[PDB]
């Protein structure tokens, strides 16, 4: 059955964000006029949070727990789907096709993705999503 759905975690294989992990915000299987192929609107992590040790001060922990996000339109041929799933209610329709046509909407969407992802990271769940892939 179909697996490229919402909350599917994928690995980006080409582009500036190659090797990064994304969550699928919206699948467009039939394509659009601007992208006449199966693609997806995804959000993901550009800079992963750093490792935390038991002797670190709380200010250093807060500094190293920061996440830099990104939002992307990406072809299906440039994605590697993973069995993992990241379910977030704050990322529901955070980006659409008209988001990428204006720089300010992209910044606001990235801020929302940032706050939701740091909340999930500080929760302690889904550690595979927040660790970087080593290749």
């Amino acid at each position: 059955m179909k697996f490229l759905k919402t909350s599917r975690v994928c690995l980006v294989t080409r582009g500036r964000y190659a090797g990064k992990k994304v969550v699928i915000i919206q699948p467009v299987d039939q394509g659009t006029k601007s992208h006449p192929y199966g693609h997806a609107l995804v959000a993901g992590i550009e800079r992963y949070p750093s490792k935390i040790t038991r002797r670190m001060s709380k200010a250093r922990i807060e500094k190293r727990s920061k996440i830099k996000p990104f939002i992307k339109v990406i072809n299906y041929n440039h994605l590697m789907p993973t069995r993992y799933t990241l379910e977030l209610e704050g990322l529901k329709a955070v980006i659409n096709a008209d988001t990428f046509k204006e720089p300010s909407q992209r910044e606001e969407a990235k801020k929302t993705v940032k706050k939701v992802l740091e909340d999930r990271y500080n929760s302690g769940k889904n550690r595979w999503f927040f660790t970087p892939l080593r290749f």
């Binding site: 935390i52 040790t53 038991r54 922990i61 727990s65 990271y121 500080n122 929760s123 302690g124 550690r127």
Partner: peptide
């Protein structure tokens, strides 16, 4: 309460798995 972001990364020092730790090699100096 301990930080949930803390993780254990054990090293398996078997043959062909990890880099061997620095041991006391004083018998073989």
């Amino acid at each position: 309460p301990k930080n949930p972001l803390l993780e254990k990364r054990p090293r398996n020092f078997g043959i062909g798995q990890d880099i061997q730790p620095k041991r006391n090699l004083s018998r073989m100096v």
